[PDB]
Amino acid sequence: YCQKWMWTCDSERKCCEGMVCRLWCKKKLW
Ligand SMILES: [Cl-]
Ligand SMILES: [Cl-]
């Protein structure tokens, strides 16, 4: 599916909508 808030993330395991990968998924400001 996609990686949720604070889940690990990488090139293939992308963060869910509204988040950005910084090793773990973080909320985007925009
Ligand atoms: Cl955050
Ligand atoms: Cl950000």
Curated annotation (Swiss-Prot):
Changing residue 6 to A: At least 10-fold decrease in affinity with Nav1.5/SCN5A. Changing residue 23 to A: No change in binding affinity with Nav1.5/SCN5A. Changing residue 24 to Y: 180-fold decrease in ability to inhibit Nav1.7/SCN9A, and decrease in ability to bind membranes. Changing residue 3 to A: No change in binding affinity with Nav1.5/SCN5A. Expressed by the venom gland. The ability to inhibit Nav1.7/SCN9A is greatly enhances by unatural modifications such as C-terminal amidation (5-fold) or C-terminal addition of -NHCH3 (25-fold). Such modifications also improve the ability to inhibit Nav1.2/SCN2A, but the selectivity for Nav1.7/SCN9A over Nav1.2/SCN2A is retained. It comes from the Eukaryota. The keyword Transferase does not apply. The record marks 22 as: Electrostatic gating-modifier of Nav1.7/SCN9A that antagonizes outward gating-charge movement through direct electrostatic repulsion. SUPFAM superfamilies: omega toxin-like. The record marks 26 as: Antagonizes outward gating-charge movement of Nav1.7/SCN9A through direct electrostatic repulsion. Changing residue 26 to R: Small increase in ability to inhibit human Nav1.7/SCN9A. In K/R; 30-fold decrease in ability to inhibit Nav1.7/SCN9A, and change in ability to bind membranes. The presence of a 'disulfide through disulfide knot' structurally defines this protein as a knottin. This is Beta/omega-theraphotoxin-Tp2a. Residues 26-30 are annotated as: Flexible tail region important for ability to inhibit Nav channel. The keyword Secreted applies. Changing residue 26 to E: Almost complete loss in ability to inhibit human Nav1.7/SCN9A. Changing residue 30 to Y: 6-fold decrease in ability to inhibit Nav1.7/SCN9A, and decrease in ability to bind membranes. One of its GO terms (cellular component) is extracellular region. Changing residue 14 to R: In K/R; 30-fold decrease in ability to inhibit Nav1.7/SCN9A, and change in ability to bind membranes. In K/R,E17K; 110-fold decrease in ability to inhibit Nav1.7/SCN9A, and change in ability to bind membranes. Keywords: Calcium channel impairing toxin, Disulfide bond, Ion channel impairing toxin, Knottin, Lipid-binding, Neurotoxin, Pharmaceutical, Secreted, Toxin, Voltage-gated calcium channel impairing toxin, Voltage-gated sodium channel impairing toxin. Residues 29-30 are annotated as: Hydrophobic dyad that anchors the toxin into the membrane while positioning it over the S3 helix of Nav1.7/SCN9A. Its main location: secreted.
